Amino acid sequence: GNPFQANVEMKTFMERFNLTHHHQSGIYVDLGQDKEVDGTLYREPAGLCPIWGKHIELQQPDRPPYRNNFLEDVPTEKEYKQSGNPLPGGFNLNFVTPSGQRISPFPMELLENSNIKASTDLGRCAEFAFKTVAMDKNNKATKYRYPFVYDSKKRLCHILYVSMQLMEGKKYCSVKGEPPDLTWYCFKPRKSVTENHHLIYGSAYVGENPDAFISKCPNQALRGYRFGVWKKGRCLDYTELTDTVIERVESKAQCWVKTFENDGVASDQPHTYPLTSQASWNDWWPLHQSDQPHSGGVGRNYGFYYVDTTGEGKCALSDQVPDCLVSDSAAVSYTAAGSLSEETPNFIIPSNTPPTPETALQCTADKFPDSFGACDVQACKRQKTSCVGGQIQSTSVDCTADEQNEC
């Protein structure tokens, strides 16, 4: 009797944390699909959940004309003639309509318009991205869809022409202008303990069903609980699992960053990039490669900050999809997909469309009596499930004096 499985409301709550199920693609680098454009096969971001706080850190020279900001416009041919190597600018789609209307960034007020069906601001930007496709050379609508960033502060929706997310090595690219002959600067995905929390990155496919992310993706940190897996008749938090990575942290936010940046996070990036005959890297989109990985969202995406009995702040990282929780008011559970904050921001609350509940961890002492599992005689602990201040509690406690003879 895992209560988190036996209770269908608690079960459906825990499902939001399964990134392999809903997101289904890379998170650190998302390149989960393939689409041909003008006779060439390109990798395309495909994941269904927004990645909160994800930004691409660029490594352009530290001088004019370089902004080191992936939200800047992709450069014009002239701009690049003027700058020298490497390319200046950013990843932002710079196209104009025949009318001369700019496509990105696009303001949320203009979206909130009946061609846009999403009920939340973040969903409206995802839906905009989903309704925006590469046009081929000739000029026809293609199936390749650009990823987006919602800058939730400025309320602006960015369609990124550049769908590349990681490029490293003097093979392909320069770091702060060294070596100088290379066309591309290097870049990589980051989250920061302090910056760009108000930026949300996503594949266009978050917009295909633009309200689904609200209730199927783990958007927000989970305060007051530690991710766990049901074993031996009780909830074992990640600290009790053999394959967990445990690192010391100074702060809870560093743990949140580590769930995205650790070496085992779900990533669709190949270890060597494609064999071309170009001098170096020379495309706006990643090329299809026979041996490309598709993580399908599987990876060390999960973790929690907690304080050990020694008083040290630590971060437990796991690839194990959680199917239970251990309650701990000081703990916070994070994923590679969600935000640092545990509070639901305004811009994923229907602007109109009732808010979907998560009432699954609410309880009453009356209807939810103290319940004890059987003693795990290996650890000599047993599950205790109960209700305190209207919140479900789940911990491992001492076995009865009698059961201890069997440990």
Per DSSP bridges, beta strands 184-185 and 173-174 are parallel
CA distance 68 to 253: 24
Q: Which residue is nearest to ligand NAG (CB)?
A: 21
* CB-CB contact of 209 with 130 (8 Å): no
Query: What are the angstrom distances between the C-alpha of 9 and each of 13, 329, 335, 362?
Result: 6, 22, 21, 11
Burial of 377 (0-12, 13-18, 19+ CB in 10 A): middle
Quick one: which H or E segment has residue 51? Answer: strand 51-52
State the DSSP code for 390.
T
CB of 218 to ligand NAG, least distance (A): 12
Q: Which is nearer to ligand NAG, 237 or 323 (CB)?
A: 323
Q: How many residues bind ligand NAG (CB under 6 A)?
A: 5
Tokens representing 358 are 């998560």
| Chosen residue from 253, 321, 325, 399 binding ligand NAG by CB under 6 A | 321
CA distance 68 to 138: 32
Tokens representing 122 are 């973040």
CB of 386 to ligand NAG, least distance (A): 24
| Chosen residue from 44, 268, 323, 328 binding ligand NAG by CB under 6 A | 323
CB of 24 to ligand NAG, least distance (A): 8
Q: Which is nearer to ligand NAG, 120 or 219 (CB)?
A: 219
Count of helices and strands (H, E) across the chain: 8, 22
If one asks whether residue 231 binds ligand NAG (CB under 6 A), the answer comes out as no
CB of 172 to ligand NAG, least distance (A): 34
What binding mask, one character per residue, do residues 17-56 give for ligand NAG by CB under 6 A, x or -? -x-xx-----------------------------------
Q: Which is nearer to ligand NAG, 30 or 323 (CB)?
A: 323
CB of 20 to ligand NAG, least distance (A): 4
State the DSSP code for 14.
H
| Region from 16-24, 85-93, 242-250, 371-379 binding ligand NAG, contact rule CB under 6 A | 16-24
Tokens representing 377 are 């005689």
Q: Which is nearer to ligand NAG, 48 or 173 (CB)?
A: 48
123 phi and psi angles, rounded to 5 deg: -65, -35
Using CB under 6 A, list all residues that contact ligand NAG. Answer: 18, 20-21, 321, 323
